[PDB]
Write a protein that binds this ligand. Structure first.
Ligand SMILES: [Ca+2]
Ligand SMILES: [Ca+2]
Ligand SMILES: [Ca+2]
Ligand SMILES: [Ca+2]
Ligand SMILES: [Ca+2]
Ligand SMILES: [Ca+2]
Ligand SMILES: [Ca+2]
Ligand SMILES: [Ca+2]
Ligand SMILES: [Ca+2]
Ligand SMILES: [Ca+2]
Ligand SMILES: [Ca+2]
Ligand SMILES: [Ca+2]
Ligand SMILES: [Ca+2]
Ligand SMILES: [Ca+2]
Ligand SMILES: [Cu+2]
Ligand SMILES: [Cu+2]
Ligand SMILES: [Cu+2]
Ligand SMILES: [Cu+2]
Ligand SMILES: [Cu+2]
Ligand SMILES: [Cu+2]
Lengths: 172, 172, 172, 172, 172, 172
């Protein structure tokens, strides 16, 4: 056991490694979405820019969890990063809906991570989740909801003019 | 035979002169398209700007081929620049489609120029085509494809509002 | 007939299209001359620079005529751009002489364009020719005459030292 | 088949997708190495910095391949990113040796990608591999070799003072 | 065999060492020419400056080949640098002619180096020759041809006034 | 005999040409040493930088002697530049020792050049050797001695850590 390790439960260490893997998975999902919008038969550059930024941001989330693990004296165990469930994301609206779905699932996992920290009486880990993850999730989810709403009201996914203009005016 | 001439086959020299003529033809086609969008009954200024820029760029392509010819010790033989197959380009979408068609044909010609350089064991000419022409074609074609896609999805050519907004938001 | 068209005769419209073609032809002639001076067995860089500039300037002349056509409500009809009568321009002096010959012919055509505008009582077109073309021709022709004179007096075309020094001191 | 697709073989498209996956794998390997050096019982910050930079660079390599795929009209198919063969990299020298081993394998794959492009007569893809990947591999491998050499000569892995000073003076 | 060595044939390694020696020889030839023009009975300072620059440039060519050798895992074997075939270069024109002759021979050697790289299926070395050597040769040869032409037309080598003025106006 | 020649003995002229050749040889030796340290199995970049600088400096020494020759009315006769006696310089210490050995031999030659100038009553050449060569040799030799001493005391050539740190702290 690590010379720095203190008040850090084996279950928490494992939950962090699981969260590290999930952040990397969400990163890979966003990468997939980003490249779909760069296709010649889709060609929505700001949707592509939007998800590329989400991909990079998710890598920051994973790195910070890895930092936590290292600082607490835990050992990182990595797992394969699974490819997304889709290769083709259909439309701008459908990607926004899939992203919101994903973010809600990630939020649920982080809330279960917080409960575990409360149950193992680890207030450092609890505060870490609160400070760096919980409000970020809330903001992410709200933004995705905002986008889904506008796209729906504009006439997406049927209106091709709607996704074109949303790409231009909201995401550009 | 030129004092500088070395490893430069009569067939390559002639193929360059043919490519020089084709670059000038594409230039003239883009000129034609550009002026069509300046018509009072079309009046799409950014379509016009877009093809005017394509025309100038195609002149750069021709000049560089003429430079190659001169540097290798070949003699430039010019041919008439044929006028385009159309005087009236119908719509923004139709010009984009005709431009993509043209660029694919020019690409095919350049790939046949590369094969000839490989077959005559002329690695200088091969690299020249690779370096200055091949990726440029790929980029040109992809961009034209991107535009065709957006215009189609927006409701062009029937939607006059679609070409107006594409002119404004993509080409402006 | 165009919504903007007013006082613009079918004969004038056709004469403009013919002038547009001639400006493009002169452009192509100058291009040919420019490349000849870049040949390894000619290698007079400032002669080459001089005619390359003339080529670009002639494209400006054509564009402005196309602008006129569009503004007046006429329809541009392009024709093939014929290659020059020579592939080999012999010498610096001979190109200057051929350029002067060309410019005098273009001037004659523009003067016939002015007469037609006077005869069709089109004072806008008349002023356009006067303002943008007539004095430009006079200046072009005078400059070419000036160059022909100096080259002759220096000992061109026989004196190879004459063209070398004229290239250096006048055109450089 | 894509509107932009031209001279792009199904085998090449698939080879690119395989290369995309390998670049992402090398990225993940470097991530693993980077975090190992941040461990409290390793604590070599510049080794960690060095591999973190390698990880980011490998993501750039993957993105450019994805760009190529999109530009050529191919469809990206992603695969899981496998975790590295090690969780514990033993020492600074051993990570450098494993990195060199990895880079040589990636180089071999890229050379097989080039052969395939030559065999399918795809000079655009051939030039792309040459321009963006081949010399980069050579440089990467040479640098890793340079580091392995210095570490060995200094007395690594036994000399803990050797890795400490190499971390300070070469990687810092 | 080197830890970095990969896909690098013994024949290529030896051909590089031979090219390294030839670049150094051309460097030494240009050094010889440069000093000849500094003689009190020649005293053409810009000819001297011109070849001194060529000498330095040829050293850059050799260094880059040595870099390639080192990066690929090959071992440099140097050979004597032979003195030029002349101690006295007669005239400005004759040096330009001898330089052009030399550059064409060096070009031939580099083209044989490229063929060998193509035959040993070494696309890294092939691209290296293309990128850093082939177009440079073409440009060098064209420039030398340009100079030979002007000097001949001016009346060199008999006209001492011709070399004086070419020294002043072209090389100065 | 040269119009500028005065008080310049045939023996001195020949001794200068011999010194010119020796400076070029020392230049080539330093080039050889420099490239050895860039080898993947040596990888001492500041040793490499150090000898590369020595190589360039030795070329300056040769050029100045060539200047002297030209200014005095002598004729330069070049000789082959012999390759060094080694292809492999073993270690940092061994190169420093070989460089010191070389510099002492060059110094001896320059002192014999000075004696000859004193004996031929050529005070211009005597002062030239004194001013540009003699103190430079003394400084070069002292520096090489200084380096040899430090390397020995640090534990070179056996201590690989010694050459690594000397490369870093003295030569970097
Ligand atoms: Ca986000
Ligand atoms: Ca899976
Ligand atoms: Ca709190
Ligand atoms: Ca274009
Ligand atoms: Ca026709
Ligand atoms: Ca290439
Ligand atoms: Ca003009
Ligand atoms: Ca004709
Ligand atoms: Ca790297
Ligand atoms: Ca697995
Ligand atoms: Ca050169
Ligand atoms: Ca010899
Ligand atoms: Ca020195
Ligand atoms: Ca020998
Ligand atoms: Cu996240
Ligand atoms: Cu083009
Ligand atoms: Cu004009
Ligand atoms: Cu990579
Ligand atoms: Cu060279
Ligand atoms: Cu010296």
């Amino acid at each position: 056991t690590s010379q720095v390790r203190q008040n850090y439960h084996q279950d928490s260490e494992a939950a962090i490694n699981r969260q590290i893997n999930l952040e990397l998975y969400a990163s890979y999902v966003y990468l997939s979405m980003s490249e779909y919008f760069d296709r010649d038969d889709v060609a929505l550059k700001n949707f592509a820019k939007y998800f590329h930024h989400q991909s990079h941001e998710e890598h920051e989330h994973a790195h910070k969890l890895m930092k936590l693990q290292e600082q607490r004296g835990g050992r990182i165990f990595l797992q394969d990063i699974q490819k997304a469930d889709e290769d083709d994301w259909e439309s701008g609206l459908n990607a926004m809906e899939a992203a919101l779905h994903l973010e809600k699932n990630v939020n649920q996992s982080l809330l279960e991570l917080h409960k575990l920290a409360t149950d193992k009486n680890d207030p450092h880990l609890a505060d870490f989740i609160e400070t760096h993850y919980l409000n970020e999730q809330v903001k992410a989810i709200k933004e995705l909801g905002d986008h889904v709403t506008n796209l729906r009201k504009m006439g997406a996914p049927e209106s091709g003019l709607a996704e074109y203009l949303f790409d231009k005016h909201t995401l550009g």
